[PDB]
């Protein structure tokens, strides 16, 4: 321990998390006090416990790889990212195995084809940090050893996962260009964004669905096609928006083109006319021309082989959903509801979908009950009627979304042997709002599973591979999130208790919430009940604490539509609509659990390439560095731990018999002619990075 005078250390600070302090007097070993001199000139005696993190030299700060730091601690990482980002305007930085990517919130001219080819053929460390380098390394490893790869981006909402994923795919399309199948696989993104992304208060272009795109390659490592897997689309988005949030983009693209002659038969108007698009109070995104976006969407559909007739059919479905949302449901007393058959919006809804308005009006306000002994028809209250109507709207959109993805996959098919593939994962990031519900619970659960997949490959596997070789290895501590995962997915867990309540015909949100209280309050450290609420619960996620409201958990987990309404659309004279509701028990939560299990396995059977995205500020400001919010994300992603294990990891390994050519004691002797840059195991030798390539020369 030598904290000599004149050098600097980091101490806690409220605003900037950490602050530098110069050691005024030299350090006497064992002393509890430290003579420091603050930046303001205020002297102090810091109560240390033999201690403060040492600040790295100004020569080592700002480097491309943070493993090159002398003192690996949180202040160093935070400080290095700050000056690289805030001052040097560098958004990419290497943190060992992972790439770190800071959201610039500004268009940077660093993705041109010239730069793409500049990265091609190069090694990982040869060039400055860039998403292209991560992609190149995956493409490089796919070719040299015929292994499937995965580009796995992560981070909270608005951190820049989708932008990273698309640029990674842009790289593959450029270097591995063969038919221009490359332009089609790239086109799959903007299509799914139009029908799958929506403005939230976290991100103007938030992904409300998860995607995993497998890019297939032939023996020449040229792209031959691709396949897209989607995960739980947000259905409530179709019929509900919070303040300053929008429905899916395509609804507004469609309304913005309502007066075009081609669309006039859809009887549309401004987005402010329709209840399903107006609810947020703002129908426009700053710096987005929805009409111009409609044009690009049409061009993109055409590029994928979807002509005018195909586009008008999906636009017809979309317009129908909007009109459905404006069907007037009046109250008849306090126990009954009513819809006029001559309701204007109902009539076009039925015309576009070839339905009979009488049957729709009837079964929006009544529910049939078959007991195989009698058939009871009970009226619905106005709230129940609106609910049944909205549920129908959400169902139509869900089928339409699946229909589009299914057709996209058909367009990207290939009649050939898949040599290898590179999967690009891009799911909705960790998010939390004032009011969190089932939607947020699922997204955060998904993110929890990704962190598990990450920790397993980076910390569990890598260290276990070293430990069982009998080599000296100080284990790196990392936050294992298996407990919170078990709390959610395992038996007697939250999602299991929810399914049980859903099986009860008299099941309710309140009773389910009570079963969570009894089972987990003062029983599971990760589960908490707020003192000033008996309608919610808070979970300690890896990223942050998140309070969830229990309202609507059963309904959303069931995700049902009344039988009579389904039959009406099943008898649709519109071929596309009839296809959606043709006849061909498990809950949303159970399906979501199972889907994610398959995904994790698919990722584990590939060589992962991780990218950690980070939102620097909450105001979408260009190159603004919010220390508190950033350090929170660095802790959640375990960046500091990742850098540490990356630093002390031995990249190159040799078996003893292999070592002789260039026995156990003979090799150890010749190696000495420092002692830290290699270690000897049971059947293997290991070396430090680049500490051998100089022998090759
Ligand atoms: N590299 C970047 N360059 C410019 N803008 C970016 C970049 N990354 C993110 N952004 C901005 O952040 C917004 C949201 O990014 P996105 O990738 O959708 O985040 P996520 O998918 O993680 O929610 C984008 O619409 C874009 O304006
Ligand atoms: O806002 V993002 O859902 O695309 O993480
Ligand atoms: Mg996204």
Residue numbers in the entry: 5 to 54, 57 to 184, 188 to 593, 621 to 698, 713 to 723, 727 to 750
What did the publication describing this PDB structure actually write?
Class X myosin has been found to be localized at the tips of filopodia, which are plasma membrane protrusions containing bundled actin that are necessary for cellular processes such as cell adhesion, migration, angiogenesis and the formation of cell–cell contacts.
To compare the structure of this pre-powerstroke state with that of class V myosins, we attempted to crystallized myosin Va in this state but were unsuccessful. However, a data set was obtained from crystals of the motor domain of myosin Vc with two molecules in the asymmetric unit. These two myosin Vc molecules have quite similar structures for their motor domain but differ in the orientation of the converter. Comparison of these PPS structures show that while the subdomains of the motor are totally conserved in position among the myosin PPS structures obtained to date, the myosin X converter is rotated compared with that of myosin Vc and other myosins.
